[model samples]
Target chain A: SGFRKMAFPSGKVEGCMVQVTCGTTTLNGLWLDDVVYCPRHVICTSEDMLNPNYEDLLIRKSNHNFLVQAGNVQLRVIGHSMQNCVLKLKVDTANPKTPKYKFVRIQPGQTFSVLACYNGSPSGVYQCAMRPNFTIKGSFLNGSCGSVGFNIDYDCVSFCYMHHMELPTGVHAGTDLEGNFYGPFVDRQTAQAAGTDTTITVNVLAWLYAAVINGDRWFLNRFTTTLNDFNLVAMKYNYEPLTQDHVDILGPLSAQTGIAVLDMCASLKELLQNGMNGRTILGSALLEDEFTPFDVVRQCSGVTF
Target chain B: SGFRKMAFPSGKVEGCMVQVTCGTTTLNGLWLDDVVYCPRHVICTSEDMLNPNYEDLLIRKSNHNFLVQAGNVQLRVIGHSMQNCVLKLKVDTANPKTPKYKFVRIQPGQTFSVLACYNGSPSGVYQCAMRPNFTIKGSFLNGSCGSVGFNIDYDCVSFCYMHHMELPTGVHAGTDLEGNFYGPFVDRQTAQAAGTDTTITVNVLAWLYAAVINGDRWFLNRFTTTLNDFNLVAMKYNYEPLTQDHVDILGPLSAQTGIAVLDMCASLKELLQNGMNGRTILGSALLEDEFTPFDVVRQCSGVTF
Candidate 1:
């Protein structure tokens, strides 16, 4: 043989340039070489795969609380954990700080849930020390979880929890907590002080819909008593279309700094009948001026802007 | 030697995994990998490194610009050999039924800038296209030239040609007048009121600074005006820090646009005189009433709030 043999790992070209042709327009014809390729085309090779390993979990100031009006506030915290693993909660600021937690001795494969509240305060960044016995450590030996070196002032709620389970949770796998157990939080409530026996308030349910939405947990600690009986309503229609609620909630939250009531039932019907294909219809007048304090869900649902 | 041999270009592996470190308190680290490793240590390894590749390339419209004033516009265009390249500016309402554009042309590389002047119209998106040789068959296909795309809106002024260069009688690159040019075709005087020497507005200069800081191309057509003036300003500063004049012209512009205006001259003065660290005051006060514009720069600069 004229060729000398060189040894290497058994492999092929890791990445290939994809020439995407849409109608005659090569909208995306770029060379993506040496990038990891997934068969399902699932994970983002450019960014670390979706939900990559992150740890060094710490929750500081967990036992602290603040009180404010029956409105909305930003919940911030200072702590160190894996790459980005701090859990914040929107607590009832009026009450003393009480972290709702779930403790489970290692089942080796079972996942547990914990509830913590974040007081929507911009000044909540603080320091935390890492627990060495639990898991990995960082390069610095002291490894004291430093102050939350970041600021997150966006209005919507945020969730974070470590995945200790061996097997993944969600619909595809056989789990009966509705698989999509992440949420079904609540809808804004309409107060009822009148003669109506059955109150009907439109319920809005938002969740992560995009295949690669950067969210790990669902938060529902802050809710009005009237709206407490709510759930993160999964669209009975399509499993893939759950993210609209999140976008909707984020829109109004971005407008002003309060948790305004969003009529979910009516909005859901409108969304189902006329999907938000090209334009957004939720934030306009639907929830703006139509909000009235009435326990009667029928009257609440019947009213329109 | 237990080596499976294979050949490929740029072989590597990037192992992906989720990890979480327990805190002094119990950690419900969501989505955190349960890798039992030392603190700050590598917990995961690439399953296959010989051929490292990831699949999905995410296409996302960033929300960073959502709060930006719709009226604020940025536009520019360039040509390798744009001798007599005609440019058309259009305000295309999403409605395809109505198409409108006003055409204008300048000598090759000559700068011309325009600011959007809108009264009561809702915010709109406009694209300015420069058709270099008029047609692809003669320009792009024949390997002659092509058009350029620019994005601009009503809030800020556009600088297309700032340099004074006369058009060439011949059509070749070398033959085109390479030196002294005439005044800007659409001079600032014509655009603004007559008589009072129209100073280069702050927004315009701030925009130039933005382009420089962002490391984008310094194309003439993208910003219209006289290039000689820009070169004069550049040379007068000796490519050092911005001068008082530069700051005065570009400060308010940057302040209005929420960009930082670093007074290099003053900074150097302080640094040299007292060996004191120079202050780099940011234009954060710009649009303080509105959402932060262009946070990516500050965020990347590691300036935590």
Candidate 2:
């Protein structure tokens, strides 16, 4: 258990070492007799050092949202719910006029994982936050601080509810009432002009795509669009894969059946006939669950999309 | 105890819950009885469900390197041993041609935290890797398999040594013999000409900066440069606050002192005289440990460089 500094809850040494990570920080420790012995200088911050009642915190993912409970507050970090292009989390104090707080700055893609101090129960080490880019900002707090909260930002996550309006009352989820829903714009050109029959301009559709990607059920059922319909005509006919799982997840979203599949996994391309297996796939392209649809993520010689 | 699905190694519930994050994926669970109770659908992949001997894995950070020992070989993920602009970790199998592996893809500035499958002992739950962007890629393996290793990339870390030559034989660490050193080019103009005295061109010096930032002792000593000397003249005068600690760091790298302070911390600015506070700093700019010097990270109104 020399490495037990990061043991599992069972107190049994399940392996050589266990990794305990919070935010961007990680601690690899071993489990010996009982306690997990973390390597030197590897401090576990999520643990409550002051209150003692709650020594550690948990971060869970439900769908696309990361949830962590702090004291009485259940902090949910989702990919939507933000407006600005940048998300910032600075030190805050009670008195606004005469402030006493440290600033945290980082490059767009920079990150930090430190147990930065704050005013809490006895003012112990509690803050564990990071900025994936200037886009995501967050701070983790526990009960010792009187009020516990985690302020997280998602300006980094690719979603569009920030600017799009909520479906107005009487504007049902599945229907295009009053033309609030617009699309099936087979191409960017069609998307631009929309048509005497459509109105999917950049702002409108951009707004629409944001909602769909965020899994806005109300908006998903309404706007009839997919990553392909937004691509150039040359790249459209290739994505014709319809397995049971594909149908389960995407058939409901096709222009014919459902709305869109902007952020799709590779099962679609893999399940496709050999005819389409590597046809539409790009160079160095990977077939992973994290990949976005090619049409939307495609690049050119002087790519801008 | 429903939350005990993620309890501590001591088998004692230090808190109501604990958060276990591996790579970029996070899991928050609670300790009810002896076993930690994770909310529904939460699976601890690092746990070795098959081989039974070893279950969990650890990822520890030392200096800038993240170390994850897989069975015998200690997988050290450093930020320097990469040459390509992208770091890829594709699925690797025994037969190269007859490959049986999965592919992982993500957008630049994108990320994924997954427990992808790999051929290992009994082929249980293993593989926790992530890519912050196109630059760095990695895959984690454990012992249940024959030999274990982690292939990590560092193209993402901001340092330059790929093309730079190493300090040659007889070239002392501190001396600039064989003209292997360059810089102290106060302004970009001086940097360009270098003079009959200095030969700090874009290529040669760019190589030097890479080495210096990577903490190459030989290169660091011979070509003494800091982020400040690289800036335009207008921005040079403001950084003049030298406390003992400052002298301890930058003093070693001053034009008249030791080497460079390319990646300096803000203790410099904070320790400045009240007269120096906030004067040279910019708008919306926060003073942070992650903040690179202004000359390097500065952005003009259509700012480039």
Candidate 3:
């Protein structure tokens, strides 16, 4: 019932195309009349098959590896290669030091569903990969076969934003009050040239500021506590205290030039006072008024530093 | 196979009791010899039935209307009265002005499950209520029959703390920076007498201060910005700007009479300096040192106001 007869090749199909399947069922048999026919007598063709590259197949397999359901967390094997290989699912918590590995034998076009729970800290991150092992003519293909990996960043779904920002490898460098060094000492120009670090840094900083102005106590508590911890860790690393000069240099290019620096300082002073309620004031004055950090910088953009 | 007989008749069962079922099977039998019985030889009891009050039943119905799943969203009718009523699920977006309602007829002891998508702001709050219409002996039971309401407060899950401190009705009298009046205007003695307002106020204020020390941008932004908004709102409300005297009056009893007020102001000034990173300083100097707000107040507890 699962067999299909392929039409004679009109044009030469790629090697990857031969492994493709129609829907969930694979086609077989030699072509005769240049008409593809399934066992059920349904007409089909190479055009209807899911022709995926080796890399794409690996990716598709990885994508289907973890299933998040109410009562069942499952790891499954998908894609055409499943017929020729034994697939193992490797699941790891945020810490790679400890991992859970499970091996499942799935027949071609069959699914293996089992109940599991991803119950480490909801904020914890996880990783899952497909390890495919196969034997072709008595030669074993193991880990050497390229496998695809997926990062389950459950942290973004929870309170992990309060955790210390992981500075990119070649961004700005600085120390907390306790003198712990962070970042790779790459200046803004070089980092920007690399096109990696700035966007993440700005986003993290902006989210932090926005949460504070909005008076999110949950974020505030975790963020503050994390800062304290980072400070302690900085001390352990022998990082020096951040100075006013450091603060000045920490600004983006827009903030570093013109009167933006002074504007920021002035706004900072005005907002910081005895019995200050930053959220109410800033939320109303800035956010409610539709002003952002970039806008604040732009407001005084013409003035000299 | 689905019926069962009751062995005893200790108490009379209500109309709702007759519709109760275990799993997919329902009970069907009259009260014979003061014992209840079901068709198809299955064992069930009033004890196995849901004995919810009219008010609670409505609430339960409302609660069961929304299902949060990975991809599919469903609304279901659960419980004994499913057959005797026309159930309507009214869903509202964050804005009360727009609402979506759906009506379904469920068979007695049968559940109506349908696919529904609650398309609203993921961050927005939603409200859903069960509107059941039942007729008994030609009398209609409408809203007065007791419907249940459910509120999905995504705000609190995100940033509700920053909204406004809910002032206890009998606590101190004052208007926030937004010019919104809060509190019951009861004196400290009267508020203390009522045993309400004081604890929450202290706790909230303590949390506010702790966040400031720890350099929580969320707390810092909200606290400072709220103060500014309060100042602006106060001016519009014809209230005087907050001064040293205002600060003194804003404290707890000990702070009002002793040197706690002065200490708070002193710490505030130190922490409010330009380029000051409260999270860095207070987190390192205070939190890391294991000092709290009470400790800060205690250091100056003996001095005269």
Candidate 4:
């Protein structure tokens, strides 16, 4: 049990599907499900106090595919033992722009949940397993059942944008993209209303790395930069701290790329050019291996790999 | 000039396209283009910064439809007169699951920018027009032409999820989903890494409205709620303030509908059940009008209307 998050995906909504397989006696649990799709909206396993933590939720329900724009799933392997059963939970995106068949595999102990940590992705697998030694303290009564509980984690809907500089100040609103309090605020209106200032900057992955990751010193600083920079560069037009020091984070020359380097951040204007291009000085490094990354982010919103 | 934000569309990235229209003497302006796709990654007008601001960038170019998974565009009308000229900057998704042609329209005074504010959208036009009052403090040397700038806005991508409870702590990452710093962290890892704990909750629209919006008092508070709830709900099963008061925001009984009401938030599970059945308590007179909303958010990730 752990936590996970990500930006909404750039794939087909109906193309998404959530399936569960079990190989044991009928189970007893109703877990929660946050199946999100498009713009912003959430659908859960139920609307009551009793959602039996994901057991019968997928029984003999082959055609019972859950459609998703993107999501963060909290799952549980119900049976005491799989010795006489086979309960495999999986998410499938066979019809996405890119197809993926992901199986949710994490050790089971007590009923866990996926915390609202974050990121952005096109199509891929993310693992947020239960760390017995690193479990956080406490649990929500609605479902989670542990003291130093282990929550489930998912890097579902991946979101991304740019932050020229600064973060927005105003905030307040709902919670989810699916629900009202939580969400992947990719749009200006939704996030602003929700209180999240959101993203925008040159090094796309680096930016995503910040907001999407949870346990990194660099991730946190960078994340705030995403919002603050947006407010600064995009709003105030005050691109101050003109040059961001990379030694603290990226360190050295490569870190130079992290900040708005003369070479990297004409605001990544040229990076786009490097992408549509022949500035092929780096190799291994075929075109795709080279800066095709520009193409990767541009076309897919987040890094595909 | 102004800025805008939204979710990378569900449309095909390669299937996405951007086109510019102009009729006049060749113009002089290179604007910025944040072309993002499926997950997280950004693509801009350039890397070295001299983007002329949407003038000659589209000079009689026919095959120049810029493909976009989703984007935030900074634009300028360019020519002093449309008298003998026709310059239009539009985003097109002719091949998307649902085709859309959006014309970016915002007043121009100084070269403005779209603050790294946020949302999630499928196919629609969002306006982040320049407000004479919103002029910024200065410029970004890269190209922003005015000291006082009009920050443009747009709710591009619409991200939604659920927040069973709290917010996350760690962060630091990239800037733009297209670039590296700013981004829409839909995943647990991304936003946590980025520092902006993302979204999740029962009332999807309310959540989108918060993070995607900027000027609202409720938007900001609620936006914070999204990330925090994600952390809480998904991690510490201790779903505090279990019952959310809607008066400050959605006051009244309808406000009651806003919380995890006995009827509304069985985690919205029954809401889904309602869609898959004949729950005829409320009647707009039609089934789709009934609680098909479960279908709306579940499939699209946000509200369709």
TM-scores for every predicted model = 0.18, 0.17, 0.21, 0.27
Model 3 chain A worst lDDT window (10 residues): A1-10
lDDT per residue as tens, model 1, A120-180: 1011111111111121111110101111111011111111122111111110111111111
Superposed Cα RMSD, model 2: 30.9
Give DockQ for candidates 1 onward, in order. 0.02, 0.04, 0.02, 0.04
- Put down candidate 4 lDDT per residue, A1-305, tens digits, no spaces: 01112222323321332222222111111122322121111111323113332334334244233222233443332222111112222333222332332223222111222221112122111112122221211111111110011111232332211011111431211111221222223322222222212212322333322222212222112222343343344333312132243212323323423442233333233333334232221110111111112222222232221
Q: What is the lDDT, from 0 to 100, of the residue B68 in candidate 4?
A: 23
Point out the higher-scoring one by TM-score: 2 or 3. 3
User: What docking tier does model 3 reach?
Assistant: incorrect
Where does candidate 2 stray beyond 4 Å? A1-245, A251-305, B1-305
What is the fnat of candidate 4?
0.07
lDDT of 4 by residue, B189-271 (tens): 22232221211232233322222222222211221234334434423332212224421232332242343223223322332
Chain A TM-score, each candidate: 0.18, 0.17, 0.18, 0.22
In the range A1-305, model 2's lDDT, one tens digit per residue, is: 00000111110112212332234443332222222222111122334322222112222212122222222233233321111111111111111122121222322121221111111111111111111111111211211111111111221111110101112111101101111112221101111222121111221222223223333223232223243443332133222222344334333324422344443322232222223232212111221111112111110000110
Model 3 per-residue lDDT tens digits across residues B15-49: 10122123343222211122222221112233432
User: What would the per-residue lDDT of candidate 2 be over residues B175-205, giving only the tens digit for each residue?
Assistant: 0111111222110111122212111111122
lDDT of 3: 0.22
Give me the runs in candidate 1 sitting further than 4 Å from their true place.
Answer: A1-305, B1-100, B103-144, B155-237, B240-248, B251-265, B268-305
RMSD of each: 31.6, 30.9, 26.1, 21.4
> lDDT (0-100) at residue A180 of candidate 1?
16
Which predicted model would earn the best TM-score?
4
